Design a protein around this nucleic acid. Sequence first.
DNA 1: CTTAAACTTAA
DNA 2: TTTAAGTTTAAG
Length: 244
Amino acid sequence: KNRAFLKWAGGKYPLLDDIKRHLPKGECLVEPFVGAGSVFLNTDFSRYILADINSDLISLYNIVKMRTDEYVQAARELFVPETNCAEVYYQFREEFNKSQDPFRRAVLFLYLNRYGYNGLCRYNLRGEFNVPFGRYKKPYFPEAELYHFAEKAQNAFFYCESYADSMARADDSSVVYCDPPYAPLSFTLEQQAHLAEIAEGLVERHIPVLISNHDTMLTREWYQRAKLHVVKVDELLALYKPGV
DNA sequence: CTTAAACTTAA
DNA sequence: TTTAAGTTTAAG
Ligand SMILES: C[S@@+](CC[C@H](N)C(=O)[O-])C[C@H]1O[C@@H](n2cnc3c(N)ncnc32)[C@H](O)[C@@H]1O
């Protein structure tokens, strides 16, 4: 199992086997909520359409893909012991927030993700990264995961857009997997239900859609028109399967 | 996770 | 003619 080079909340890494077990085959996989892209890195589709609302994330992904060797060499220089203190961290965080250069921001983004607290990605309403120092002993530099990502990204397109726009890209040969922000144990409840509506529209166009979420009475109401599978609170896999 | 600041509401 | 109580936001 291949790991993502980013630390991300709800990476769905221990759930990969279950997801892949209920994920239909197709020419193209569409991910409206790509995140770290664990499913992307552990599946074998001919091409991928990967989207997310986070512009820094999508920007980073395209840079790692197109300027791989340049990026790895630049980002590696920040994974040294000298940068592992709070004072240096908050200066790099400041440099990130003031920079208008996509490459430099992408380089610092990896640093902030590995040196920041719990790999959190948090912004204020100004759009400024404000995750505090993580105080780690020895942050790992994901050089292998970076190169593996770039290799797989050769057949992937990245888009910075909401789920409704990315799911509209799906066609007859597509499969859609959705990993939205977790429902109550930002992404509103109305958006949670609207996601299910779009999936119902797609499944009538003979486009298979798989949704992962918490197993609650509220999520079961949303995904009531789908085949429900309980994993291991519990994890819910809502599969929308077209009837040929 | 926590506290503090920013901002609104009521009466 | 006011300000404590609430709600949201910022950030260690
Ligand atoms: C990794 S997925 C959810 C993972 C896991 N279920 C959890 O909640 O911890 C979260 C991602 O969805 C993206 N996202 C949030 N709202 C979105 C939206 N409206 N449209 C597309 N992507 C969105 C965020 O950028 C974030 O990276």
